[PDB]
């Protein structure tokens, strides 16, 4: 951030259904996400089974 | 056993539509991508694009994009590509395949011919 | 994209004999790259994957090979009912791209 001010960042993780669902689209069977800056940090480990149809 | 049924032959004049259906049976309809292949008598195998079922991403080859457009019946186990705007460049045959498990085509279906 | 380049359309070969077909990625696809066997009139049928991996139901005939980003189908002991194309895809990244297709011939 070389700006003026502040910036809001939405990011996201996807949790899949089913395993296959999981490898289908990113390969390894147990993804991650860590979204960090110089003094804070998230770390967010997706996770894969069912919920309700929607 | 795994078996991938497509549609009947077609004809279409040239500026209309068509949509091919490919059937899939004997495994988990959800669990795999649905490819469809192109095939031209002379131009070999050009790869469309692929489908993921359940939550009906598409991915397109480029070459492809506003030409065709997959869809998923996840009742009907039953994926469908539309081809739009029709020209004598889209007679070939057409093919649905299901891969492995995420990559290598293993199981293809039996092609429909499309003619304009 | 990634081309995959057959030169070969057309191979003469003779019964019992060894034939081997030539695919060469224009950039690596690492192993990952399949061999399809299409017959007059029927759907493609798979033969290799991983470049070297017999597909089940396989002869033990075809084999497939591969150095750096050359890749080589090789049937020994070829029979009549080997009459067919053959084509090469690489399955590494998107787009799927395939090789021009090498009709085998059987000659004298």
């Known amino acids: 951030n070389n700006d003026n001010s502040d910036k809001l960042y939405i990011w996201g993780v996807h949790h899949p259904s089913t395993d296959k669902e999981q490898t289908n689209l990113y390969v390894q069977a147990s993804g991650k996400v860590t979204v960090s800056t110089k003094r804070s940090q998230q770390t967010i480990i997706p996770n894969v089974g069912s919920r309700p149809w929607v | 056993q795994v078996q991938l049924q497509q549609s009947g032959t077609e004809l279409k004049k040239p500026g209309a539509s068509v949509k091919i259906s490919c059937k899939a049976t004997?495994?988990?309809?959800?669990?795999?991508?649905i490819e469809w292949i192109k095939q031209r008598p002379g131009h070999g195998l050009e790869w469309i694009g692929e489908?993921?079922?359940?939550?009906?991403?598409?991915n397109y080859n480029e070459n492809f994009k506003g030409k065709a457009t997959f869809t998923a019946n996840t009742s009907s186990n039953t994926v469908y590509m539309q081809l739009s705007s029709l020209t004598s460049e889209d007679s070939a045959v057409y093919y649905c395949?299901?891969?492995?498990?995420?990559?290598?085509?293993?199981?293809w279906g039996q092609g429909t011919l499309v003619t304009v | 994209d990634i081309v995959m380049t057959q030169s070969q359309k057309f191979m003469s070969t003779s019964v019992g004999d060894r034939v081997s077909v030539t695919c060469k990625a224009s950039?690596?696809?690492?192993?990952?790259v399949a061999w399809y066997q299409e017959k007059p009139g029927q759907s493609p049928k798979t033969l290799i994957y991983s470049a070297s991996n017999r597909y089940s139901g396989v002869p033990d005939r075809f084999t497939g090979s591969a150095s750096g980003t050359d890749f080589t189908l090789t049937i020994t002991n070829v029979q009549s009912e080997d009459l067919a194309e053959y084509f090469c895809?690489?399955?590494?990244?998107?787009?799927?791209?395939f090789g021009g297709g090498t009709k085998l011939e059987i000659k004298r």
């Open positions: 489908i993921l079922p359940e939550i009906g991403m598409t």
């Open positions: 395949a299901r891969p492995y498990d995420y990559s290598w085509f293993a199981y």
């Open positions: 950039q690596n696809v690492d192993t990952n």
């Open positions: 895809q690489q399955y590494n990244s998107y787009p799927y791209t």
């Open positions: 004997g495994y988990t309809f959800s669990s795999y991508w």
